[PDB]
Ligand binder design. Sequence first.
Ligand SMILES: [K+]
Ligand SMILES: [Mg+2]
Ligand SMILES: [Mg+2]
Ligand SMILES: [Mg+2]
Ligand SMILES: [Mg+2]
Ligand SMILES: [Mg+2]
Ligand SMILES: [Mg+2]
Ligand SMILES: [Mg+2]
Ligand SMILES: [Mg+2]
Ligand SMILES: [Mg+2]
Lengths: 48, 178, 170, 148
Amino acid sequence: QTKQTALVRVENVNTREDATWYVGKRVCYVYHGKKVKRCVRWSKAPAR
Amino acid sequence: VKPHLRHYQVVGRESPSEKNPEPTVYKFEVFAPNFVVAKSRFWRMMRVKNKVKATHGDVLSCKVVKDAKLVARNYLVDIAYYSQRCGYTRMVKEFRDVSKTGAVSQAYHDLASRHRARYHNIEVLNVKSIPDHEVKHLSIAQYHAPNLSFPLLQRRTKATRKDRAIFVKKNTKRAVVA
Amino acid sequence: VKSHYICAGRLVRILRGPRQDRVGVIVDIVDANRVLVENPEDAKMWRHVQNLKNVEPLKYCVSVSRNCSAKALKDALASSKALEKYAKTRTAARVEAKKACAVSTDFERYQLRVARRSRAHWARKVFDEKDAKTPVSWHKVALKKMLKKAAKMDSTEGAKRRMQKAIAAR
Amino acid sequence: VSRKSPEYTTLRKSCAPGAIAIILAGRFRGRRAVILKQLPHNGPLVVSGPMKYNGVPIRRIDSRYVIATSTTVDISSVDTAPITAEVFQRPKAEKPTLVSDARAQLQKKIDAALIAAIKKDAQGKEKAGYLRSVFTVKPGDAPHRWNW
RNA sequence: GGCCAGAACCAGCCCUACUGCAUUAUCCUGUCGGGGAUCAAAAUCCGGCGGGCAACGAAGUGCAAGAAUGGGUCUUGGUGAAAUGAGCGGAGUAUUUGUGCUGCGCACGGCGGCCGCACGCACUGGUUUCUUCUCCGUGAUGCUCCAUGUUGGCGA
RNA sequence: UUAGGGAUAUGUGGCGUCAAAACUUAUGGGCUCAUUCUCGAUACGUGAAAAGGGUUGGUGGAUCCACCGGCCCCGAAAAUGGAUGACGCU
RNA sequence: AUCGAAUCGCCACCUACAAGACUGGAGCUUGCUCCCUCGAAGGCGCCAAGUAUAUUCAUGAUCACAAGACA
Ligand SMILES: [K+]
Ligand SMILES: [Mg+2]
Ligand SMILES: [Mg+2]
Ligand SMILES: [Mg+2]
Ligand SMILES: [Mg+2]
Ligand SMILES: [Mg+2]
Ligand SMILES: [Mg+2]
Ligand SMILES: [Mg+2]
Ligand SMILES: [Mg+2]
Ligand SMILES: [Mg+2]
């Protein structure tokens, strides 16, 4: 395997022309750790 | 699908020399994927029939013969092929198609399927369109009855590619996964 | 047998490919796999070859002969009035609706969403009134069974006194 | 014409003033608003909504974070002249509900003009409901196939 | 801020869409004959004769040069510390590329000098009916390296 | 055919799962059914002869007979439990 | 009670059954005709409890896990 490129399957996208529409879009992976660490707007918005 | 072979006419001759100032001009019909293969077959036939080699010859013309309008027709194809066990075998077959190129491509596929003969071991002798009353095989003759009709059974209909799915509800068209 | 046979003059509808969802007339049969299709009404339906796996036969058959001329085909179609009859069916209306849905804008999808919601609201209104008269839902069926047993014993002297005291206390 | 000119712009043709847009990010994600103008020097767009319908105030937003639809409202008689970068400028703070009177007055005037324009336009009730509506991605939806 | 992100523009590079010229005849279409089949027809098929462009996005065919000027670059550098630009600046708003039509002489084909020329070469031949922008400009008195934007988050 | 790294595109080989690629592509044509080493999918190479017979083709001759091709079957018997790489595939 | 977390459609109309060489109903002429609900849609849900000129949203200041979740 070559680990610096990832493959993603998206619901309701089943053709190559459909996948072209998403070129350039932003992608996020969400998880959790064990302790609370720094984040964006750590002091401006303590609720985050 | 459109046939994978095209109908070529090749016109050629031997290069003039002191021995033969005015050589004969030959015409040749072939069915080939492209004009390079057509020229190769033309020179092979010239070498094996008239003792003229491609290194001492000229090609005056190499053109495509256009097909006629699409009409359901009966085509008679006289064809031959080689095998090591039996030498050369010649046969005459009847097909139903809409063009001579289609009929010849169908004949090539049929020979490959039923006798394991490849393209370069096959020579086409003749192809023509024949009337209905001259057809001899019943498997072909059955298709020109005046009241031919039949239903479509055991069909496998696949959905449009954009609409295909993996999991679908039982008695419902709702898709569950893709 | 209620299955439409493949024959000369039979109307068909194309399943897949660039000619999807159009209709045409069969003019000749080549073999078990292929037919010739034409339709003078549509501009993209000149005489051509169709594979039989891409065809859905319809219920209308015009009376023509095999390899009929263009003039003969056009006259037969008008006389049969098959296209007019087909256009009034439910499946024909469904096909045109799918084309409309594929080209809709964001504002048009909003208008459809309003219309569906308005229908569902009025359906609940109509259902509720008939439900009160004739009990058919789960809760109204329970009420019908419960009222008869509850009422006969709620008329007890002790129950009335306790109910009066409880209501007065509140 | 000059790239250094304040009038220079490369905004796409769909994001014309008076068009209705869908907000894709930020606090007001999913709401629909009206595009008013673009700030000079190829700056961000300004949207109102207006606030009475969906709660969006006059705000700046980058054009890459909206979807501009083909539904438009004629806002010629709104006079969006006072909206400038000075109103969005903020005073610096050093060594450490609430709305300024000028901002409130500007919001009131712009909102009144926009409401008048929407009501005067045909299909006004439908447009008002459309502006009140909310956009979301449901299961089974394929936005990559839709026409906006 | 020598940290983390978003967007804009510039140079280069990469991948897209937008396409003209030759060719077609074993072909296209009427009419007469025979031929076939039918319930009577037509149709598949074979001769003659008269016209031809199968031209809808004609054709699965032989070449193609269409960016005057759509997106990506956390796959490259930058924010003008030399921008060399059909792109920056200035001045004109007319040149001259092709298409169409056409003159003389030569060339080419046919017949045995005359007849043909699909439009070849020369005269940079004529015409302007369609089509297209055109012309000027910044050395280093810098031998070499480094040093310059915008909007938020974090940092008091 | 090989300095240390990115991007793009290919070679041999592949696109049911293992395993990246037809989420099992086509609006392509034919052929094939295999009951205990359990048809086939084995380039090099890592199984098979003489001789024989279910379907699908081709030459001749009659008014139905010989001939010879494709795929399949018989011929085909060993020593720990096991191998188209495994599951499976019609 | 540590606990802050990843997950983002729900229903008491789907949540019963069987067949793809025969699915609504007849008729003989067996592939055609006639009749019907016309034979390729589980119901809701996407911001006024419902399609009407009703109503608070900012300063959380241009993206950032969605600063919100018993629909
Ligand atoms: K005739
Ligand atoms: Mg701001
Ligand atoms: Mg004739
Ligand atoms: Mg210029
Ligand atoms: Mg895979
Ligand atoms: Mg045999
Ligand atoms: Mg095995
Ligand atoms: Mg095996
Ligand atoms: Mg293997
Ligand atoms: Mg969160």
